[PDB]
């Protein structure tokens, strides 16, 4: 992760940033045996580095790589930023399953056309999308996110900490059909303006009709679900499309978001 330069070094090519000695540089990947893609901790510029001028200092698992590297480039307190260092890790440095900046498009045109008071994502993980619509919530208005695994919802709450959403975001530690039930139980929750499905693929159907015979569900709670089309939500993507019960409508950027507008019982 975190690199020293160890020689001065003006910039030649038309790739590479220019540096001085003991400037500290994060890592993105290699290329050659040479060139790595890096980013300046003096300038936060990304660019090239030639590896005979550069070392790592000491700076596991994919997950805490995407936290450290947001804690070291991203200005804490502001969402905006963390987005665009997730964004630019997982575009650069290592694939990861977040809903990206362009599926995120799609939510931000949402999350702002419907002013959800009350959103309740499943599927954290690292806590990408969290943070992508807790920034744009109205003041006073909530998000619940459930994660199964408690490693990702560790890192999500670090995530969010950084962020400065946390007190406007509120991690579940559980599996979808364990925390739903528990929702007007446990967390006063009237209905759900709004949820979001990027959990696993299959839950997709249970949780759907879990929420409804839970009653979370009022007549205009938008439903958006990642990872239609790609992976594929097939039964999902049926079931709803063909109910009255729901008003779909269907996003491109060819991967796609469906809102599926519950029109009743
Ligand atoms: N049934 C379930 N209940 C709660 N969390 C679940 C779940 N099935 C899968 N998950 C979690 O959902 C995550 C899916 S990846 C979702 C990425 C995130 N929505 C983003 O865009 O940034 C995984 O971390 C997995 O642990
Ligand atoms: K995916």
Redesign the pocket.
Known sequence: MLFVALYDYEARTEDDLSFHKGEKFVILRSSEGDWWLAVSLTTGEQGYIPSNYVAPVGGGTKEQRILEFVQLVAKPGDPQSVLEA?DQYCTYAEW?????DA??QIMDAVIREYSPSLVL????????????MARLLQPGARLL?????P???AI?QQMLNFAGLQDKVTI?N??????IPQLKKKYDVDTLDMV?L???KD?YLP?TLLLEKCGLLRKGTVLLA?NVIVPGTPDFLAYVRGSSSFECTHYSSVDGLEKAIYQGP
């Open positions: 997730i990861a399953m977040n809903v990206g599926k995120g994502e499943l599927g954290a993980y690292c806590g990408y999308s969290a943070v992508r996110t459930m994660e199964i695994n490693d990702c919802a999500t579940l559980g599996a979808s059909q364990d925390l979001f990027d959990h696993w839950r949780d990642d």
